[PDB]
Amino acid sequence: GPPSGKTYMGWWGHMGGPKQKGITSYAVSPYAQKPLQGIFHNAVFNSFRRFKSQFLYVLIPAGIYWYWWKNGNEYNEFLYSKAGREELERVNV
Amino acid sequence: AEVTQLSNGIVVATEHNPSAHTASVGVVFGSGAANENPYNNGVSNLWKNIFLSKENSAVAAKEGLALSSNISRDFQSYIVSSLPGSTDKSLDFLNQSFIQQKANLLSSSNFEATKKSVLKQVQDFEDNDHPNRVLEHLHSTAFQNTPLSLPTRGTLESLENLVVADLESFANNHFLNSNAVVVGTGNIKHEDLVNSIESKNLSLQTGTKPVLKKKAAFLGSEVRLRDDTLPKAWISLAVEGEPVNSPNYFVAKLAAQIFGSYNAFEPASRLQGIKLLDNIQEYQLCDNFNHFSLSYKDSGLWGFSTATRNVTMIDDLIHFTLKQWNRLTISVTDTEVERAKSLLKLQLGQLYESGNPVNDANLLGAEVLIKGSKLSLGEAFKKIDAITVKDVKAWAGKRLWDQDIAIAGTGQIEGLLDYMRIRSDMSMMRW
Ligand SMILES: CCCCCCCCCCCO[C@@H]1O[C@H](CO)[C@@H](O[C@H]2O[C@H](CO)[C@@H](O)[C@H](O)[C@H]2O)[C@H](O)[C@H]1O
């Protein structure tokens, strides 16, 4: 097999990270854990966590764009109604 | 292996050996590390060390006596060795050390020095004995929050918090007559050792029964102590095994013998009749491994330990080993069972009939403390010869096939995959 280029990721046994020392990890077999009831205990309780932390970053631009749309949509509606033909002749041509 | 046991309050058990040349007398208690708490853990290892204290050893050396102490999970021993005739003086030292030196050995100078010794002793073990340190963590994760999880030597944290008071409280609760057996092995006769015991009297620390608590429980889990600075990956993996007195005690041991032990550096070891060897030698998946069937009072551990420098093929080492284990449930052959019978006998032989009296003392005591009398090889060999392929399959079908596992490892274990990937290999797909 030919020599290919070096990258920032290797494989099992030589992944490419720094040497690890002092960290101990523990785990328990899924077979020994409470038959999954965390769907309506720590998922619905902890629900809206990802919401109230991030929603503003989405809601403000969402609101800005929705308002701009509704505003322009209503202006169009008026421009094409009887009451708006005067301003329509102006702003158009 | 031939026993003889009598009682008069103090239970005495011996095993004569006309070709001994020496004799060992001592006491063994039915309490070990599994009888300690997570906070007084190491108190037994501490007792062992003050008994073997420099002062105490000089007092025995002048008498032509050699001291020995072994701390295990279920039992604890203190043995004295001498020539066949000086046996009368060994009992005097035992009586002196455990029925008079309740404050002699516990002096501020002797204690603080011993404590300091076992502290460095344990710090070294935890620092350099990777295969045993891993095996100890195997017990620690497998029986977590349960008696069997505590390390026999104890932890550095609880070790340095121990005071003479801790040593005494343990002694008051475990160094009792109802929880002991006076042992005599070597060439001395039974109806002679009991006399010297009857020669004295008293009953200091008697009548009381030892304490009780919760039973050992196996939990499928793992503890990973990754250390990339080490040159190897040391791992130990096992299922819940058999307790002493289990109907499958010998079947489980025969199963372990089937996969055996291996040292990739010894020519003869590479030639053993273990199918697993055909899979791991092509790419040299490890430097060594050894299967085991550890048995204690409440539970056991059946599995193996391995050491390897092939850090990129650990998944294959594990995969191939567990795939061979599956065979015990579905395809183990007659010849494999017959080869295991022969070798189990051989190992039981080298264990129970070594020329060493202190080994026989520990085995005699620890065994009578559970079943009431050490088992003869003749009977063991008969149970072993009766094991059929079906016995092995039925056993593997319950302790191995698709059962939870306990894992522990240190060193370069990045290549050791997740729990589930390992747990999956405990069975095979079928129609
Ligand atoms: C491309 C779409 C086509 C989808 C077709 C669907 C395929 C369904 C395959 C279903 C079952 O296939 C079946 O899986 C189970 C595991 O779940 C296997 O079980 C195996 O592992 C389980 C453990 O998890 C063991 O208890 C069992 O003794 C062992 O045989 C079984 O031997 C296999 O036969």
Curated annotation (Swiss-Prot), chain A:
Cell location: Mitochondrion inner membrane
Keyword match rRNA-binding: no
Superkingdom, taxonomy of origin: Eukaryota
GO cellular component, one term: mitochondrion
Pfam families, per database record: UcrQ (PF02939)
Segments in the Mitochondrial intermembrane topological domain: 80-93
Molecular functions (GO terms): ubiquinol-cytochrome-c reductase activity
Function of the protein: Component of the ubiquinol-cytochrome c oxidoreductase, a multisubunit transmembrane complex that is part of the mitochondrial electron transport chain which drives oxidative phosphorylation.
Protein name: Cytochrome b-c1 complex subunit 8, mitochondrial
Source species taxonomy: Eukaryota, Fungi, Dikarya, Ascomycota, Saccharomycotina
From Swiss-Prot, chain B:
Cited SUPFAM superfamilies: LuxS/MPP-like metallohydrolase
Domain of life, per lineage: Eukaryota
One cellular component term from this protein's GO annotations in UniProt: mitochondrial inner membrane
Compartment list: Mitochondrion inner membrane
Family designation: Belongs to the peptidase M16 family. UQCRC1/QCR1 subfamily.
Gene that specifies this protein: COR1
Gene3D superfamilies reported in the protein's UniProt record: Metalloenzyme, LuxS/M16 peptidase-like
Subunit field text: Component of the ubiquinol-cytochrome c oxidoreductase (cytochrome b-c1 complex, complex III, CIII), a multisubunit enzyme composed of 10 subunits. The complex is composed of 3 respiratory subunits cytochrome b (COB), cytochrome c1 (CYT1) and Rieske protein (RIP1), 2 core protein subunits COR1 and QCR2, and 5 low-molecular weight protein subunits QCR6, QCR7, QCR8, QCR9 and QCR10.
Function: Component of the ubiquinol-cytochrome c oxidoreductase, a multisubunit transmembrane complex that is part of the mitochondrial electron transport chain which drives oxidative phosphorylation.
Topology relative to the membrane: Peripheral membrane protein
Other notes: Present with 19300 molecules/cell in log phase SD medium.
Disulfide bond annotation, renumbered to this chain: none
Listed name of the protein: Cytochrome b-c1 complex subunit 1, mitochondrial
Keywords: Electron transport, Membrane, Mitochondrion, Mitochondrion inner membrane, Respiratory chain, Transit peptide, Transport
Pfam family, one: Peptidase_M16
GO biological process terms held by the UniProt record: aerobic respiration; cellular respiration; mitochondrial electron transport, ubiquinol to cytochrome c; protein processing involved in protein targeting to mitochondrion; proton transmembrane transport
Location (main, coarse): mitochondrion
GO MF, one example: metal ion binding
Organism: Saccharomyces cerevisiae (strain ATCC 204508 / S288c) (Baker's yeast)
